[PDB]
From a paper:
The apo form of Aae Hfq, refined to 1.49 Å resolution in space group P1, reveals a dodecamer comprised of two hexamers in a head-to-tail orientation. Initial Aae Hfq crystals were obtained with a crystallization reagent comprised of 0.1 M sodium cacodylate, 5%(w/v) PEG 8000, 40%(v/v) MPD; inclusion of the additive [Co(NH3)6]Cl3 at ∼10 mM in the final crystallization drop improved the specimen size and quality. These apo Aae Hfq crystals formed in space group P1, with unit-cell parameters a = 63.46, b = 66.06, c = 66.10 Å, α = 60.05, β = 83.94, γ = 77.17°. The tubes run along the crystallographic a axis, and their lateral packing yields near-sixfold symmetry along this direction; a slight translational shift of the dodecamers in adjacent unit cells, in the plane perpendicular to a, causes the rings to be slightly offset with respect to the lattice tubes (the tubes are not perfectly cylindrical, insofar as the sixfold axis of an individual Hfq ring is not coaxial with the principal axis of its parent tube). In the dodecamer, the distal face of one Hfq ring is exposed (termed the DE ring), while the other ring features a proximal-exposed face (the PE ring). Specifically, 3663 ± 244 Å2 of SASA is occluded between the PE and DE hexamers in the PE–DE complex. Of the 25 MPD molecules, 24 occupy sixfold-symmetric positions near the proximal face of Aae Hfq (the remaining MPD is near the distal face of the DE ring). The individual subunits of Aae Hfq are similar in structure, with a mean pairwise r.m.s.d. of less than ∼0.3 Å for all monomer backbone atoms.
Author numbering:
A (entry chain F), B (entry chain A): 1 to 72
C (entry chain E), E (entry chain D): 4 to 72
D (entry chain B): 3 to 72
F (entry chain C): 2 to 72
Write the structure that this text describes.
Amino acid sequence: GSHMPYKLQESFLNTARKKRVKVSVYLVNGVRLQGRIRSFDLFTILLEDGKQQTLVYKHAITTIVPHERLEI
Amino acid sequence: GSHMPYKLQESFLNTARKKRVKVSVYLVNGVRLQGRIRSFDLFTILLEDGKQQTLVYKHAITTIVPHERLEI
Amino acid sequence: MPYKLQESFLNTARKKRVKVSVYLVNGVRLQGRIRSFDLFTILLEDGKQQTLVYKHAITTIVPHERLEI
Amino acid sequence: HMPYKLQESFLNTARKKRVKVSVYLVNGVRLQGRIRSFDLFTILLEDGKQQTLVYKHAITTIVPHERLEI
Amino acid sequence: MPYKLQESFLNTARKKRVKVSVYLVNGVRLQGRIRSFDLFTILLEDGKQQTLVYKHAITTIVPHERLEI
Amino acid sequence: SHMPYKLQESFLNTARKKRVKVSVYLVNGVRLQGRIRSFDLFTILLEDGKQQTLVYKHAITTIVPHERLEI
Ligand SMILES: [Cl-]
């Protein structure tokens, strides 16, 4: 079909978001963030860990590892 | 459906700007900037801390953490 | 064709279920099989664990078997 | 409609006012000088006699040594 | 002609089968011959081992013989 | 004095035509040295004696000419 350049990334993020799965978000400098994905757009992800919000730039992420299996 | 590619990033930055909330801006090299968001555009953010202005390139940011909760 | 090599490499590793090492800019080495990929990301699987990898963080991908691309 | 409004105003004001700046790089190096020119991807810094072409992709922050009226 | 130099350099090294050193942003040095390339990746071969290299991770490519570009 | 467009192109082309030695500093602290033989949108070809080096611009932090450039 047509070009869908975000099909995997969008499905992964939306599934983690909708299922409220805790994720580890690893950054290029080795820092590991932890929380749930509250929202995301083209270039950013909003992580929530308790009462703390963190806006994460995707360009700084190496990997996202869910703490439960996602049925993507 | 509809997706807006900047809605999260713009709402986060604009709410912190309008509410004058102090933020920590973490950089790829581990440096942590602190201040208030005075302005922003597609690729840069203008931080203010006391009398000092800093132009930050978004490509160097890993995360932004607000010091108060943002109602987004 | 801007993606002819990259797409052929990733798809062959995916279809043949070949283990790969994915080396990152910071020296971390991931290991697993490529389950899926799109323009900017690759889904790795290692046993039960899934990992979404951003291509911008990858330096090299090394297959554990020879790929007939 | 104005994706560069802040970046251009900041760089152009520093350039026109000949304000000394610190340009911090991703690897921690701190350049110093005045902005002589800039384009989409680069900034030309002058520190006395020496010219340096800086790639914006390597910059983390620019800190002016005097307040910029922007 | 945004790729005139890059394409000529990579194609000449590929066609002449010249060994190259590919230096990465983190200081790792890969070695091999360029088997193929596209817009964003290079396929390096060192004997039996294939490595897909993302160009965004490369700092420099140094050929081990002079290329008549 | 201001090239809000074409600064990079003018700088690189002036160093190339004048055969000025440059230091090319990389993101990881490595300093390359040579003359710019050619360049395109994303790469620069450095020459240092008999050795050619293709440099990706995305890895460069700064380029410092060893003589003043009249851009
Ligand atoms: Cl898509």
